[PDB]
Amino acid sequence: TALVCDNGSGLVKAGFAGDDAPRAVFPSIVGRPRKDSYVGDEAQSKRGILTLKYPIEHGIITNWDDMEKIWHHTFYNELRVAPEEHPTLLTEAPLNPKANREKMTQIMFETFNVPAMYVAIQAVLSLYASGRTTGIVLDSGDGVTHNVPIYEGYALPHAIMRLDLAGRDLTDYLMKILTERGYSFVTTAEREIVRDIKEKLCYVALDFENEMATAASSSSLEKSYELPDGQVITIGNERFRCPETLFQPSFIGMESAGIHETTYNSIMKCDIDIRKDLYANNVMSGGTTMYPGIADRMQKEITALAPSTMKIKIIAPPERKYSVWIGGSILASLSTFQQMWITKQEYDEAGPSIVHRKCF
Amino acid sequence: MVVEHPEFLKAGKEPGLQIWRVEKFDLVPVPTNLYGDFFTGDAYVILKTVQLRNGNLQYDLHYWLGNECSQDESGAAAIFTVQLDDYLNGRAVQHREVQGFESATFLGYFKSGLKYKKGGVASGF
Ligand SMILES: Nc1ncnc2c1ncn2[C@@H]1O[C@H](COP(=O)(O)OP(=O)(O)OP(=O)(O)O)[C@@H](O)[C@H]1O
Ligand SMILES: [Ca+2]
Numbered sequence: 001t002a003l004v005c006d007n008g009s010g011l012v013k014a015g016f017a018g019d020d021a022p023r024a025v026f027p028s029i030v031g032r033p034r035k036d037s038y039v040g041d042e043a044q045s046k047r048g049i050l051t052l053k054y055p056i057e058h059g060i061i062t063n064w065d066d067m068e069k070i071w072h073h074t075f076y077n078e079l080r081v082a083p084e085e086h087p088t089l090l091t092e093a094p095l096n097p098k099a100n101r102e103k104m105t106q107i108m109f110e111t112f113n114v115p116a117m118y119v120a121i122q123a124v125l126s127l128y129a130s131g132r133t134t135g136i137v138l139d140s141g142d143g144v145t146h147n148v149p150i151y152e153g154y155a156l157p158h159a160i161m162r163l164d165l166a167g168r169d170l171t172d173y174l175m176k177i178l179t180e181r182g183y184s185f186v187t188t189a190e191r192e193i194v195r196d197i198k199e200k201l202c203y204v205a206l207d208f209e210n211e212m213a214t215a216a217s218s219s220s221l222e223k224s225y226e227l228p229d230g231q232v233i234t235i236g237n238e239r240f241r242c243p244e245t246l247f248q249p250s251f252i253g254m255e256s257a258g259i260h261e262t263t264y265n266s267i268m269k270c271d272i273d274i275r276k277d278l279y280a281n282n283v284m285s286g287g288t289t290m291y292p293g294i295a296d297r298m299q300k301e302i303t304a305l306a307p308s309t310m311k312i313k314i315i316a317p318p319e320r321k322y323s324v325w326i327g328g329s330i331l332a333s334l335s336t337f338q339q340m341w342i343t344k345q346e347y348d349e350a351g352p353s354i355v356h357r358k359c360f
Numbered sequence: 361m362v363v364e365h366p367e368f369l370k371a372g373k374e375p376g377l378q379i380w381r382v383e384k385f386d387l388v389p390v391p392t393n394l395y396g397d398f399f400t401g402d403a404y405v406i407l408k409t410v411q412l413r414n415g416n417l418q419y420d421l422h423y424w425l426g427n428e429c430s431q432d433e434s435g436a437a438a439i440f441t442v443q444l445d446d447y448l449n450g451r452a453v454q455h456r457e458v459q460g461f462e463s464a465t466f467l468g469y470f471k472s473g474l475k476y477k478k479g480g481v482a483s484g485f
């Protein structure tokens with residue numbers, strides 16, 4: 001039976017091909033002494049005695065030695081199966097370097113002895129998960145954000161937009177503006193708390209200036225939150241100021257343009273004929289997209305950029321934290337996909353270079 | 361990427377209309393006599409093969425999404441349409457047809473009217 005594995009920057013989604021969801025999800029972290037190594041929660045809990053590292057920087061596999069540990073843990077610890085008894089589908093970031101694609105395949109066959117494997121692009125799966133062939137996806141996880149336009153099944157490498165702004169950055173920003181208010185959130189333990197707050201209370205403001213004016217005037221926009229030790233705190237205008245950075249990157253001192261802007265630029269940089277369908281199918285993926293009133297604030301911002309007579313439609317399914325994984329789960333389960341695999345026989349024949357031809 | 365699935369082999373071998381329904385991660389040919397009656401709780405795939413004057417064939421692939429159809433079915437339909445296109449040398453035009461918002465063309469295929477009927481085969485998950 002097939003296995004699916006979405007390797008995110010912050011979190012590792014993984015499960016069985018045929019499930020409606022991943023059986024295993026955990027932080028993509030590897031800790032070694034300052035057994036001989038820990039992965040995921042084990043590492044974080046024992047952060048004081050270990051040197052933690054992230055084997056994926058911005059959706060790209062940097063540390064291969066550690067990435068092997070990630071996978072070992074995925075197979076034996078989390079999912080508990082025999083890698084050599086199950087075909088394994090992996091995922092990649094759009095614009096993944098040739099070298100990675102090969103090195104990635106090699107590891108599965110040589111260091112893990114899988115009987116078959118495959119590597120599809122995350123953003124594409126997300127689109128397939130929405131029941132769509134053509135469209136532009138906005139996958140924004142913890143490490144990075146992308147704009148991957150897709151037409152009749154395949155992506156458009158030239159129009160792809162990458163953005164070094166994601167969950168982790170918003171978490172760090174929240175820490176800054178919440179401390180300035182009066183509280184104190186600096187240590188690694190205090191971050192985790194600020195991350196919980198981000199995921200619970202934060203939301204995207206339809207009209208930013210009107211919320212800042214409504215925040216300053218009444219206190220009908222404020223919310224409370226209980227810390228672990230007991231102390232309660234009120235969170236005010238920073239509910240919507242944190243996710244606003246996604247639309248105005250200048251907030252953390254960046255040069256990059258807004259997510260609504262990059263989306264436009266991407267669509268514009270495609271063929272004139274397929275522009276209508278990209279505007280009409282804006283699928284949202286990843287975790288840092290889960291802000292309430294996000295599909296609404298986008299829907300408003302883009303209609304203002306695109307022509308008046310243009311039909312627009314933002315999509316953000318409730319399961320968009322796992323869109324990527326789910327798309328793959330469906331793909332791996334297809335009867336036709338029995339032939340799309342890269343078998344060991346084919347790896348021995350052609351070696352790591354086979355990935356470039358079999359998988360797009 | 362070479363598909364050995366029986367229905368792909370029969371796919372677009374001559375002019376006419378061919379229908380399949382998604383059934384637990386697999387295409388299954390609908391009975392010729394039940395063409396036009398769609399279960400709103402399932403996803404289908406439709407291939408219109410038209411005889412061109414140049415001796416060649418025209419392909420138009422329409423994947424229909426029922427209102428109550430499950431995510432595995434809606435995803436399968438879309439992937440299968442992407443696969444059939446490649447199988448037929450990327451020549452086909454891909455069409456996404458939602459229940460109630462079908463394009464004139466797709467409605468135009470059915471002479472005795474397109475009918476809906478509640479129900480449908482279970483999800484594969
Ligand atoms: N409701 C929420 N509001 C805001 N952020 C959220 C919410 N739920 C999850 N997140 C954020 O999403 C991030 C993880 O999402 P995801 O798994 O898509 O990222 P990833 O795929 O690991 O990262 P990348 O896209 O860089 O590979 C976390 O950093 C988390 O803070
Ligand atoms: Ca991801």
Ligand SMILES: [Ca+2]
Nearest residue numbers: 401402480481
């Ligand atoms: Ca069904």
